[PDB]
Design a protein around this ligand. Structure first.
Ligand SMILES: [Fe+3]
Length: 329
């Protein structure tokens, strides 16, 4: 049974998935790799179904990949997204902070501002920015959600617990953890800024371009530099908050079909990659943005043999992620 069951987070992803399934079935030979679609309400449900052996694969932001290795799930990153170009594969991205032109604040002064995050635990939208302000938060810095809550004057942090920390969903009631929530994810976080619901969107250098196709309309937005200055949105190389490692497909440590997933995905990038088949597209969709994989991807690279989650993220990010709950100041 050479069939990879991919975990679709919710109605939109599911539809991309069912047509991912369908087009692969027709272009790929009878005995090649198959794909099946399992729908779940959230990545976190996808982590658990995979460990429970009801699915095989799901693409996660790096921040989440760490959550996924943590017991009792024990998932490994297995195939990485890459950006830039096929000719020049980029296995990382810039985390930035996007803002409107002429509007006061800088990095060192984000108290009482309204904020749009991609999601709780995700790299650019959460782990990086929150980690930068960890110690300036008001004590007690535990639990984190509470402390980020009081620190802004309203937020959207997808996947957070709306009933426990109600101010982290003030900008997106329910803190929906799927594209259903329009303020969820990178393009979701950015839409949240555009509509003036929030003062800053913590996203990735590609987001603004993925979401606004006019250099005219973009001159209206700026980035927050670390040295408490602002810069035009195409100058991210010089005004980013941190570099983080690319989203990876994660899979079971034991019996995980890691080899089968690579054969699926690497055949997928052949037929339905960037400007390949008019028909189906792996890194875009009519149904939405960043479904099953980031639109900003160009392809996949195999994660080097037996590199577990800790090894993938880097030593000082893993230390960062942890001390983003515990280490004093
Ligand atoms: Fe990310």
């Amino acid at each position: 049974d050479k069939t990879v069951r991919w975990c679709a987070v919710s109605e939109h992803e599911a539809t991309k998935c069912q047509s991912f399934r369908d087009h692969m079935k027709s272009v790929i030979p009878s005995d090649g790799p198959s794909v099946a679609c399992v729908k779940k309400a959230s990545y976190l449900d996808c982590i658990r179904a995979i460990a429970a052996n009801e699915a095989d694969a799901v693409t996660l932001d790096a921040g989440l990949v760490y959550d996924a290795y943590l017991a009792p799930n024990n998932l490994k990153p297995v195939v990485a997204e890459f950006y830039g170009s096929k000719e020049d594969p980029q296995t990382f991205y810039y985390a930035v902070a996007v803002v409107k032109k002429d509007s006061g604040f800088q990095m060192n002064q984000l108290r009482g501002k309204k904020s749009c995050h991609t999601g709780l635990g995700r790299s650019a939208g959460w782990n990086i920015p929150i980690g930068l302000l960890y110690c300036d938060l008001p004590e007690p810095r535990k639990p984190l959600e509470k402390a980020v809550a009081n620190f802004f004057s309203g937020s959207c942090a997808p996947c957070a617990d709306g009933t426990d920390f109600p101010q982290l969903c003030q900008l997106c009631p329910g803190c929906g953890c799927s594209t259903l929530n329009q303020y969820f994810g990178y393009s979701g976080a950015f839409k949240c800024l555009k509509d003036g619901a929030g003062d800053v969107a913590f996203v990735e250098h590609s987001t603004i371009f993925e979401n606004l196709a006019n250099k005219a309309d973009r001159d209206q937005y700026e980035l927050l530099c670390l040295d408490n200055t602002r810069k035009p949105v195409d100058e991210y190389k010089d005004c980013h908050l941190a570099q983080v490692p690319s989203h990876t497909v994660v899979a079971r440590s034991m019996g995980g079909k890691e080899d089968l997933i690579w054969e699926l995905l690497n055949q997928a990038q052949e037929h339905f990659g960037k400007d390949k088949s008019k028909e189906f597209q792996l890194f875009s969709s009519p149904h939405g943005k960043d479904l099953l994989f980031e639109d900003s991807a160009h392809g996949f690279l195999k994660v080097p043999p037996r590199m577990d989650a800790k090894m993938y993220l880097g030593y000082e990010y893993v230390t960062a992620i942890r001390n983003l709950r515990e280490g004093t100041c």
